[PDB]
Amino acid sequence: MASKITEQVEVIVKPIMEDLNFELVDVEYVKEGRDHFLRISIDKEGGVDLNDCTLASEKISEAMDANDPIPEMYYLDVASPGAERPIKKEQDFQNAITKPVFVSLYVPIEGEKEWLGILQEVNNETIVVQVKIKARTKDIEIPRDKIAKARHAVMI
Amino acid sequence: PTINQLVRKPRQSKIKKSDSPALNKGFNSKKKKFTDLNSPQKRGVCTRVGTMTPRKPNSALRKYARVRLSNNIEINAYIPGIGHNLQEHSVVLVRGGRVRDLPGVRYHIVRGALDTSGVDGRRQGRSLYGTKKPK
RNA sequence: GCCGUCGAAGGUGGGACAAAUGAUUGGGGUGAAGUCGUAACAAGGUAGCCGUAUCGGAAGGUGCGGCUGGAUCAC
RNA sequence: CCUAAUCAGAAAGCCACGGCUAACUACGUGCCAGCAGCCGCGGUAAUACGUAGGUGGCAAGCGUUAUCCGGAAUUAUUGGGCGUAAAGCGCGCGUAGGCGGUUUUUUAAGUCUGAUGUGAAAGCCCACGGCUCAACCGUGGAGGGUCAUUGGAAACUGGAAAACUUGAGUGCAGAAGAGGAAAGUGGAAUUCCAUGUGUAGCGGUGAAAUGCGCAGAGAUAUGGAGGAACACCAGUGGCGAAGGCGACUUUCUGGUCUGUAACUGACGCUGAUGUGCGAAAGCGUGGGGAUCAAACAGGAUUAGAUACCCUGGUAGUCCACGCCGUAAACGAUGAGUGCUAAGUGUUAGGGGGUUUCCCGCCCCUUAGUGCUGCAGCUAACGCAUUAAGCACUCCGCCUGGGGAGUACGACCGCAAGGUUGAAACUCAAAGGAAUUGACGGGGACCCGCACAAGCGGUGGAGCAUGUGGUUUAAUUCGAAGCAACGCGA
RNA sequence: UUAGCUAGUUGGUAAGGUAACGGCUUACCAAGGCAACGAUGCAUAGCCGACCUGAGAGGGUGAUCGGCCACACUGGAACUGAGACACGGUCCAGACUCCUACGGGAGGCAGCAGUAGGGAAUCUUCCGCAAUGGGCGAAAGCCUGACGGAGCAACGCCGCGUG
């Protein structure tokens, strides 16, 4: 159960940072009628090379090869995610000043609240992104109090 | 069926749906108009890369990555092939292909011409694998 | 030159679909732990259909109705 | 484009080789890397990874991908089913409509059967001309209407007219019934309970708990109550179109057929829409509640115990109408038509002869419902006069599995929620029949020192070797349930 | 899982109005008129000739090319002229965007190249009017992004070898 997968989290968080010295921000498992899919978001550096995923997956799989208190075998999903992150905290927005983010704010336009812009600078609640919508350039201050949903976005 | 009911009916076929949702650029970059472009290729980036593990006995560790093409539509896609030099948020070309590794995915990257560079040590990449004739 | 027909365009107000959002509430799971709950026997176990309901968290069972169904499986 | 010369000399590759499909071996590689369109290969040994060769295919190109059809007949008009793998509402009534009996004419509507005008052109096919040729345009022809018009025609369908009849009608004689719904009548008796007797326990179990209960439970016999469905028949009896329809009776009707040919004269046909009827549950309301009964709890069980084994009781089941309209309403066999070996019954008929009622027999069919089986057909299964054989008008479905009868709409439904009805994802299967294995246990046949009945061996005690161990300077191997231990030896 | 649509609408009356026609639009009176044989609504769409695969049946497609239709920043017009409510007239307004002395002026490639971007990328910001094709005339001629021509994309066939 959840307690069990947490126990696996502590036991296998050792390797991750004695192997690739990564840290798992979490391990979560999804299942659809088969060995469930334990997505372990491995961190360390942000721009994780694919090799830095292959070798890390080798390490973690070998670690759990002899370690599986959970009776059945399961899919290890070794994830080395990028910077893309849901922006709940203000620091989440502060780190992302480099990269574009998209937010859903209490005042939408055209029915839906979700809009993507590319941050130029950090200004507390106010936003000076080069938000680009409909091929339109502008720095639009999106009030965070309006923001019902906010996530850091892909850079493309 | 009877001739009359045959007449007042089309006898419709069982026409399929393309299991490859290959909606290429079409009108994505104006008006965001959905357009069934059948392009064999769009340019686009894999914002994240990953690696799910296969089960035993063939522990053939397969690696995935989530990608956005010219239409920028989310999908987790596996990488085939040996050797690469790309990373997170690298531009990649993905071809349509469903393999025995994992469900939830029906496409595949191609090697040789973009950030996921192929290897020119073999001779099979003489006309393919993105790499030139091994000379 | 004025008025008068029409007159876009454009906005105003009444509302409709509305669209994401979402007041706060609700439902759930959850014990890290703040209650402190004990500490005995741990289950005396069960099993050929469908619809429908009443529960069982469910796992199923009481079912009501009428019964079509098509044991196991290998290299 | 052509000529003077230029050499084989510039100019060509690529794909594949397990097979599928053309072509393989050697090697390094090691179930790992991997390859990977499919079967799947690769575990060190690969013609399935890579390399070299060798081969093939192919080339100014090759390979991959995106899509359309062939395939894919995977729409099944051509060119599917629904006996079971996917499919018959649940079953109706019927509007339109679908098709249309026998014969006599007209019509020419069609239909056929030419003529006309008219189908841009090109492409289009054919021939042919040019471009070396090809590619290619061109040339003409062909082709190209389901177009309009007129020539015939009257087979056919459609009319028009004329009638015929068995179908249909309805006609007369009968035969025929769980058909329907209303109403009443009875019964044994769930349960409850009256009275009287009567214990001590009932009680459920592993123990029982509980729950009932000593003031009478469980039990009894006398007595009822309520509501319930009606002990046999009962069956391939039957009615039905189904749902379903069996206590009896009646209600006032619906249907059943034998014979019938009564004679208008096709009046027929299935049947989109529509649309009625309709297991159970559930439920609205208003009653009943006799059971039964979820939930329930007492309560075994066990922190927990409703889990089940209890005890009682329980919405509702049950009466009034609606909602309910759904199901295994399943034969997943639409209906009608008529044909087609048999054997061979039924359920009602009839007839002939047969004989006393032939009722007794037989045989002919009437109309169904059998079993075996001609042919036929099905993957198989089997049907086979009642076809799943043959054909015909008319309905619906089915489109891999499943995703999901589920989403969702809409409508409806008191509600329940229903009806209705997916997308997306995913997998190469899912699936059907058969076809071969195994299971998985007793009885019975049955034999054997297997026993009975006795009888022979081990250790008792000690000794020789061996099996093993000890230690050794070494204490040499190889093996050990039956199938080791004087075994090799 | 698109069933009601429906009021100048229906028809006529008189006017006008256009080449005509009529609710075509006015005023009249009247209530129509469509609706399962699927109106209506929605999506979507240029049309066909033609083309691709298929023995064919069929299915699918609709590049140039033939024509037909629609459009020319957007809306609302209207002058003109045989004919436009005018792909490269106009007016206005809406923007849009641009610029101004800020007072208001200015523009509209779904013409052709090309540009930017987009896209996987698609061809000259090429030439010419040699050939025709117009417009205007008698003509030269004007312009011709029609078209012709060469120019790029082994993009497609065909064809020479790569002995």
Curated annotation (Swiss-Prot), chain A:
The keyword Cytoplasm applies. Disulfide bonds: none annotated. The keyword Cytoplasm applies. GO terms for biological process: ribosomal small subunit assembly; translation. CDD domains: YlxS_C. Keywords: Cytoplasm, Ribosome biogenesis. InterPro entries: Ribosome_maturation_RimP, RimP_C, RimP_C_sf, RimP_N, RimP_N_sf. Coiled coil: none annotated. It is found in: Cytoplasm. One of its GO terms (cellular component) is cytosol. Required for maturation of 30S ribosomal subunits. NCBIfam families: PRK00092.1-2 (NF000928). Belongs to the RimP family. This is Ribosome maturation factor RimP. The gene is rimP.
Curated annotation (Swiss-Prot), chain B:
InterPro entries: NA-bd_OB-fold, Ribosomal_uS12, Ribosomal_uS12_bac. Keywords: Methylation, Ribonucleoprotein, Ribosomal protein, RNA-binding, rRNA-binding, tRNA-binding. With S4 and S5 plays an important role in translational accuracy. GO terms for molecular function: rRNA binding; structural constituent of ribosome; tRNA binding. One of its GO terms (biological process) is translation. GO terms for cellular component: small ribosomal subunit. Pfam families: Ribosom_S12_S23 (PF00164). This is Small ribosomal subunit protein uS12. The gene is rpsL. It comes from the Bacteria. Residues 1-56, 117-135 are annotated as: Disordered. SUPFAM superfamilies: Nucleic acid-binding proteins. Signal peptide: none annotated. Belongs to the universal ribosomal protein uS12 family.
